[PDB]
Symmetry: C2
Subunit: 388 residues, 2 copies
């Protein structure tokens, strides 16, 4: 497999990995999709603008498509990229990688969120290996599955687990691969908090680029018509879009149990996000691939441990806390349909912001929606800040 | 189909249609199939917290799922059908209600109002006590226990227009008007029913008085004992850790309604958490299963949560704290210590003409279900105190 040779200085050799969902898991999935019931018509379910969530119609259509969804091609595509696992602190940590043949390639770790996965970055990874050979690849790209997500095991059954533990475990992936001299982190959604913690607390992480920075407007800050739509969208998300945060953060076992009962229940909860959060419309096939993977791996109940960190609501939000001010080189890319679009003057207050790029297209799932924009920003930021 | 207590009061302007519950054989067969084949979450740190700090435990749900496999609906149905039941058509909705009608020309009419995730079932123990104490001939009251629009055998709400708490009260008032009670009735409510009962008493002439066992509010701007400290901490637990379902119901009702229609055990997870956490007296598993089973058979859940969006964006004032909804008519309140937001008398008094106050040592959110005799003593005491003929 191209791009799959372990960097020469690795401290722990990773075990190679391939996904092979059993025929029985596939057919249990179809059985329960078929067994699922739909809601009767309701006023709320008939609103085509989704002001009360997904429409009954969308869900009925998506369920029918699911019955013809074939996992094998998607699984084959996933397996076309090099994948590995480490054993770290009793957990299996899965990651996708593209390793360069250049000895001093710049290591980068790309950090997904919820309800995402490594799947978000495969179009970017496809663009990378279209553009480069293993010989001309300037980067080592590492795309781990966060603890509790898809092929990563955990979190533990017997102790609480939070974002600082997540960062500690993810940093060790990069250390294991020989990157103690330095790597760059890139993060969105929950990955943006992980990226911030890596940059703030872990020596090996030399710089961090974010495409999300969840904050209110700082009081130390004065607007344009783009600043106006950013504030209106942020207020929409805070007021109407944050039910799942409160339920994940306070009753993770209840919602975790309810949505494991049926794959179509998980489809409803997760599909609403792929619909509302995107700038560029995400195809139904991409939603189904993600929900199917979460299902096969029982991700959802293992994946929501992060949300309880905000209950009770902290004095300062993470991004606004001086404890988590990013002193290392810090980059931000602005996508207008990000769930909380944040202007430069906001972001600048949370770190040492040396890189700023704004885009006209794209929303929350920047890598998935705009892989070329994402890859361009990532190359530019890494070239701009990397110090050898 | 003659039934004791089912004679329509003499002043009725509209005769209701008799109703009986008959869930089909195929629904009962299908429910058992769907329970058995429901998938369960794997073990998680959160699912192993036996103080339920993060919701229901994996162990509780697996046990409830096992018990559900051998729950028999038909004897619960026979018990339900021993009470008179009716429907009215009102503004194109079918409104189900249970009733006990007195033979006395001047019996005091009373409407009992359930909330979410409850139903007319909450009041059956109280109705059982009433009909054990009174024959139709000695019954001092007419008791009406309707299904709110969207709940169990009541249809709607409409597919094509929004529907809110004021529409709910208008429609429930017409049940009482149809039965000839334009001269007066008393309302009683908890949970969402306490909001409806408030609107009835504030805005509708036929409602003469109202008793509540819930008065959802913060500490009033108008204004601490042992109990008051405890009530404040419980109210603060509810607002901080207990209101996830409110935000979700009120912002994304379509998503959660669809999610929870897919499987009866999805519904049970969501609703069972509330019967566990909100109760003062432990509510038996069989009662929870009965309630969740009824919701499942009647596709209640997606139709029942329209009330919660009235809080989004957060209104200028909470209903109970708004002079617009201050109760001028005689207002009674019963304090149950394990109510989700226990409100001292000083708080409640800022919201209406409080002429009746009763505090209790036991009982929680589902007062009539947990403490039927306490609930009934209060209701009759309050009605006898305020009714003016």
């Amino acid at each position: 497999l191209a791009y799959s040779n372990i960097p020469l200085g690795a401290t722990v050799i990773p075990s190679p990995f391939q996904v092979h969902i059993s025929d029985e898991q596939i057919e249990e999935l179809q059985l329960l999709v078929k067994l699922s019931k739909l809601a009767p018509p309701t006023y709320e379910g008939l609103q085509q603008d989704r002001r009360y969530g997904i429409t009954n119609e969308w869900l009925a259509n998506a369920k029918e498509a699911w019955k013809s969804f074939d996992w094998r091609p998607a699984e084959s595509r996933i397996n076309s990229f090099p994948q590995f696992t480490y054993d770290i602190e009793g957990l299996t940590i899965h990651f996708v990688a593209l390793f360069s043949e250049k000895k001093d390639a710049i290591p980068i770790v790309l950090l997904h969120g919820w309800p995402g996965s490594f799947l978000e970055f495969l179009p970017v990874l496809t663009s990378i290996r279209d553009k480069y050979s293993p010989e001309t690849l300037p980067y080592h790209i590492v795309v781990p599955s966060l603890p509790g997500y898809t092929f990563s095991s955990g979190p533990p059954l017997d102790v609480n687990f939070n974002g600082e533990d997540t960062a500690r475990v993810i940093n060790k992936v990069m250390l294991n691969l020989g990157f103690e001299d330095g790597y760059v982190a890139q993060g969105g959604d929950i990955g943006s908090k992980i990226g911030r913690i890596l940059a703030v607390d872990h020596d090996a992480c030399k710089a961090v680029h974010l495409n999300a920075c969840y904050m209110g407007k700082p009081s130390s800050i004065d607007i344009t018509e783009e600043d106006k739509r950013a504030l209106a969208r942020a207020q929409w998300f805070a007021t109407f879009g944050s039910g799942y945060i409160v339920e994940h953060g306070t009753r993770p076992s209840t919602i975790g149990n309810a949505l494991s009962t049926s794959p179509v229940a998980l489809l409803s909860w997760i599909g609403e996000k792929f619909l509302d959060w995107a700038g560029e419309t995400i195809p139904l096939e991409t939603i189904l691939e993600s929900v199917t993977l979460y299902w096969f791996t029982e991700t959802f109940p293992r994946s929501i441990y992060h949300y309880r960190e905000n209950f009770p609501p902290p004095k300062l939000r993470h991004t606004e806390d001086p404890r988590w001010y990013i002193r290392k080189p810090f980059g931000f890319s602005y996508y207008p349909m990000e769930v909380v679009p944040t202007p430069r003057a906001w972001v600048e207050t949370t770190g040492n912001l040396v890189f700023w790029q704004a885009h006209e297209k794209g929303g929350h799932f920047a890598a998935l929606e705009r892989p070329q924009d994402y890859l361009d920003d990532l190359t530019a930021f890494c070239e701009q800040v990397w110090a050898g």
